[PDB]
Ligand binder design. Structure first.
Ligand SMILES: *[C@@H]1O[C@H](CO)[C@@H](O)[C@H](O)[C@H]1NC(C)=O
Ligand SMILES: *[C@@H]1O[C@H](CO)[C@@H](O)[C@H](O)[C@H]1NC(C)=O
Ligand SMILES: *[C@@H]1O[C@H](CO)[C@@H](O)[C@H](O)[C@H]1NC(C)=O
Ligand SMILES: *[C@@H]1O[C@H](CO)[C@@H](O)[C@H](O)[C@H]1NC(C)=O
Ligand SMILES: *[C@@H]1O[C@H](CO)[C@@H](O)[C@H](O)[C@H]1NC(C)=O
Ligand SMILES: *[C@@H]1O[C@H](CO)[C@@H](O)[C@H](O)[C@H]1NC(C)=O
Ligand SMILES: *[C@@H]1O[C@H](CO)[C@@H](O)[C@H](O)[C@H]1NC(C)=O
Lengths: 201, 595
């Protein structure tokens, strides 16, 4: 039948400001029609690495809920947004499960997220006592104790503030330019699946 | 929980803060160097200050981790690089006096003006005029006046400065658990803790001696030939049995002999391989010169240039309104930013220099995956050696016929090969005894082997004994004749040029046997050979993480300096010099028979 009520992917992808990778934004997508053909047909979105589902059959497979996790990382850490990868982002900032059903989308945003002085609004967690669970968000600013003496909240010797800033500048290489990443996770529940693509006449 | 994990976490936080602060410092130095304006000067000063203060406080926090309980070699190497006191180990008054001495040596060398008596209405500086009168003039007494006047004035104003400088640097090195400042400079080649690849600070001098002992016959023949040709230039002043007069070496100090190609040409009737006319006829602009160098580097298999390299590098002199430093420099700003500061003219020399600086940039690009404090050459020779091998391969007639600068009907006979090899020998073999002599004098004066009142007598004797160059007149200790050179006056290690010269031809033989070259070594090109590029990139990717002995074993399959590639490079020139030194006397006498 005649289709309306598109899913708000414009509020996720074409947002003015994305969150940091340590405080990654999660937007749930429900009760709308989800046209993935828009995301495929845009040429600036360079990386469309989809795992556990084919990008061609996204328009036919219907799911219960769609999770759009949005954050900003560097160029070299785009590859860490993948199942089974390791590094600072995968261990401490954003962890993907190995049985991950969903696609990742990443694109360069040097024109938006970089300033000549340097952009300091984007932060990543450098030190955690334990590696993160999949889809876990850690927003704590508690002092990291690398030594034996208690830190007592003061970042002195062997006590570091766990969050470091990505100082994005428009003159950095491709591996250090800011990359905006949106991760779509598709889940199916016993509830009636209401996020589906359109049907042809 | 252990000390090593504390060191790893500390190094991670240091690496992040270091790369941001270093980037700001390098961007401000770049903005000063491409745009000489006083706000750029104060921006560079503020960023340099915040960088030096950052490393001061991070070395203070880094010396709380002892090294004897750290077993990982990379963490140990990063902490050894970070924990170096430098000049901070002294008292504040002595450190301030040392920086004052270094600054006033810099201002004396930069603003040293020496001119003719009885004509004081203007006078002539070293870099514009004295270099030209030393390299271009053919008059004996004019070169003698310039040489003696500059050394007399600069020596009398610099001798007590060097007198205090040697004592302050000796105290700095002995406070830093080194034997002397020469041991501190030899500590760059020190490798400790790796089995089989261990290299001591003390071993380098006999290694240099062991290489120079096989350098010495070839240099003697070259010296004899140069002496014969200077006999053609100066009829009565030079003796057949004696050394060369010092002010006839084409430079101010005798460091390079490349200004004698006009006087010492083997075959002047044969043309040179200068391709400047081909560039200007075909309108080769600087952008496409760097594009051709990039084509060479993707022919050998190395990655091409970044987009920010083409956007941000200033490859052309900007104009009269904006002043910039014209010195060719390759910049690794950090955060994947690589630039070349070069005011390119349309010449073959700037083409070869562009290949050299892009070799520098490729070396900087390859170790970008390394941690920040390991982002350097494995020793100080490797960084210039990997650029000079590109300058070697791009200068071959085969490569110039490949890229269209040289005609396919060009005849490469043996005479132009002999004169090309003699130009390369005056550039390369000529600087080796001067470099080894200067460093060995500096090593003994830091060691205290040379007494304080015996400096000039020892130095001139070694110049007679090693380099085979005699002074015009005797000089007493009111003079400081070493200190007239840029590197010794501004606290620079000088053995890097000797080691770079050896590593250059070692890398050239390793790449040319990798690329299956079937001729002599000086004809060889590494273009269109992916395996030679992979063999080289195995060393370029290491950076400072591995010992330089291990990096050398990765390239040439040897862990120590070898002089056999350099003499194998100059083998037909060696046979030619043996042929034409039959009538002349090879070798020199230490007597003052020329003057
Ligand atoms: C964002 O803006 C671009 C601009 O052309 C548009 O093509 C696209 O449909 C918009 N929405 C999304 C979700 O990308
Ligand atoms: C160089 O500095 C001057 C100083 O005012 C400035 O006007 C000019 O724009 C600078 N050049 C560049 C290329 O930024
Ligand atoms: C040393 O530490 C680095 C990371 O800091 C690690 O990759 C490497 O495997 C370690 N080497 C050894 C021998 O433990
Ligand atoms: C650096 O100097 C300080 C102050 O004397 C000293 O405690 C420290 O051991 C020195 N470090 C090294 C590596 O010599
Ligand atoms: C470098 O080479 C790659 C492929 O070899 C190409 O995609 C890229 O555009 C090149 N970049 C430049 C600046 O030539
Ligand atoms: C070049 O080769 C020819 C042919 O053997 C020989 O006659 C001539 O002497 C050689 N010239 C030089 C400078 O070696
Ligand atoms: C290297 O390859 C390029 C392209 O295949 C070719 O134009 C060039 O002539 C080759 N170089 C040599 C020395 O043959």
């Amino acid at each position: 039948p005649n289709i309306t009520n598109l899913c708000p992917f414009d509020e996720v992808f074409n947002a003015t400001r994305f969150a940091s990778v340590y405080a990654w934004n999660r937007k749930r997508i429900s009760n709308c029609v989800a046209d993935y053909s828009v995301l495929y047909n845009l040429a600036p979105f360079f990386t469309f690495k989809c795992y556990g589902v084919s990008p061609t059959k996204l328009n036919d497979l219907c799911f219960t809920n769609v999770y759009a996790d949005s954050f900003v990382i560097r160029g070299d850490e785009v590859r860490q947004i993948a199942p089974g990868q390791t590094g600072n982002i995968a261990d401490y900032n954003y962890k993907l499960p190995d049985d991950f059903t969903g696609c990742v989308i990443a694109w360069n945003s040097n024109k938006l997220d970089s300033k000549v002085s340097g952009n300091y609004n984007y932060l990543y967690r450098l030190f955690r006592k334990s590696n993160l669970k999949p889809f876990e968000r850690d927003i704590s600013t508690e002092i990291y104790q690398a030594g034996n003496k208690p830190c007592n909240g003061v970042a002195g010797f062997n006590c570091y503030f766990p969050l470091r800033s990505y100082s994005f500048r428009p003159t950095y290489g491709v591996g250090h330019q800011p990359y905006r990443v949106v991760v779509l996770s598709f889940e199916l529940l016993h509830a009636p699946a209401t996020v589906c693509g359109p049907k042809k006449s | 929980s252990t000390i090593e994990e504390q060191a790893k976490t500390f190094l991670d936080k240091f690496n992040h803060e270091a790369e941001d602060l270093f980037y700001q410092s390098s961007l401000a130095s770049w903005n000063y160097n491409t745009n000489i304006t006083e706000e750029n000067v104060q921006n560079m000063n503020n960023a340099g200050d915040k960088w030096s203060a950052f490393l001061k406080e991070q070395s203070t926090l880094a010396q709380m981790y002892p090294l004897q309980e750290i077993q990982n070699l990379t963490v140990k190497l990063q902490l050894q690089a970070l924990q170096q006191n430098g000049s901070s180990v002294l008292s504040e008054d002595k450190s301030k006096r040392l920086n004052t001495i270094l600054n006033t040596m810099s201002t004396i060398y930069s603003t040293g003006k020496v001119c003719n008596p009885d004509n004081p209405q203007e006078c002539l500086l070293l870099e514009p005029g004295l270099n030209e009168i030393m390299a271009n003039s053919l008059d004996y007494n004019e070169r003698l006046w310039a040489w003696e006047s500059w050394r007399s004035e600069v020596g009398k104003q610099l001798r007590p400065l060097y007198e205090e400088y040697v004592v302050l640097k000796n105290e700095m090195a002995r406070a830093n658990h080194y034997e002397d400042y020469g041991d501190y400079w030899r500590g760059d080649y020190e490798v400790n803790g790796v089995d089989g690849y261990d290299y001591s600070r003390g071993q380098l001098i006999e290694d240099v001696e062991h290489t120079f002992e096989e350098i010495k016959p070839l240099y003697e023949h070259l010296h004899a030939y140069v002496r014969a040709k200077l006999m053609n230039a100066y009829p009565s002043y030079i003796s057949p049995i004696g050394c060369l007069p010092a002010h006839l070496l084409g430079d101010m100090w005798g460091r390079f002999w490349t200004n004698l190609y006009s006087l010492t040409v083997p075959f002047g009737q044969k043309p040179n391989i200068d391709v400047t006319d081909a560039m200007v006829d075909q309108a080769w602009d600087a952008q496409r010169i760097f594009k051709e160098a990039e084509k060479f580097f993707v022919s050998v298999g190395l990655p091409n240039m970044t987009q920010g390299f083409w956007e941000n590098s200033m490859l052309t002199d900007p104009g009269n309104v904006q002043k910039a430093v014209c010195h060719p420099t390759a910049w690794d700003l950090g955060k994947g930013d690589f630039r070349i500061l070069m005011c390119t003219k349309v010449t073959m020399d700037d083409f070869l220099t562009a290949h050299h600086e892009m070799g520098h940039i490729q070396y900087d690009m390859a170790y970008a995956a390394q941690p920040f404090l390991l982002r350097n050459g494995a020793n100080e020779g490797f960084h210039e050696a990997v650029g000079e091998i590109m300058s070697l391969s791009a200068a071959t007639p085969k490569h110039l016929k490949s890229i269209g600068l040289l005609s396919p009907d060009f005849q490469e006979d043996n005479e132009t090969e002999i004169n090309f090899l003699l130009k390369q020998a005056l550039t390369i073999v000529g600087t080796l005894p001067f470099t080894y002599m200067l460093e060995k004098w500096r090593w003994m004066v830091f060691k205290g082997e040379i007494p304080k009142d015996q400096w000039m007598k020892k130095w001139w004797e070694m110049k007679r004994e090693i380099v085979g160059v005699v002074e015009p007149v005797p000089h007493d200790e009111t003079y400081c004749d070493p200190a007239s050179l840029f590197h010794v006056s501004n606290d620079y290690s000088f053995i890097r040029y000797y080691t770079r010269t050896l590593y250059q031809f070692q890398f050239q033989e390793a790449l040319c046997q990798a690329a299956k070259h079937e001729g002599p070594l000086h004809k060889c090109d590494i273009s269109n050979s992916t395996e030679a590029g992979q063999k080289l990139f195995n060393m370029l990717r290491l950076g400072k993480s591995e010992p330089w002995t291990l990096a050398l074993e990765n390239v040439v399959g040897a862990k120590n300096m070898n002089v056999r590639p350099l003499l194998n490079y100059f083998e037909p020139l060696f046979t030619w010099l043996k042929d034409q030194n039959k009538n002349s006397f090879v070798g020199w006498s230490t007597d003052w028979s020329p003057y």
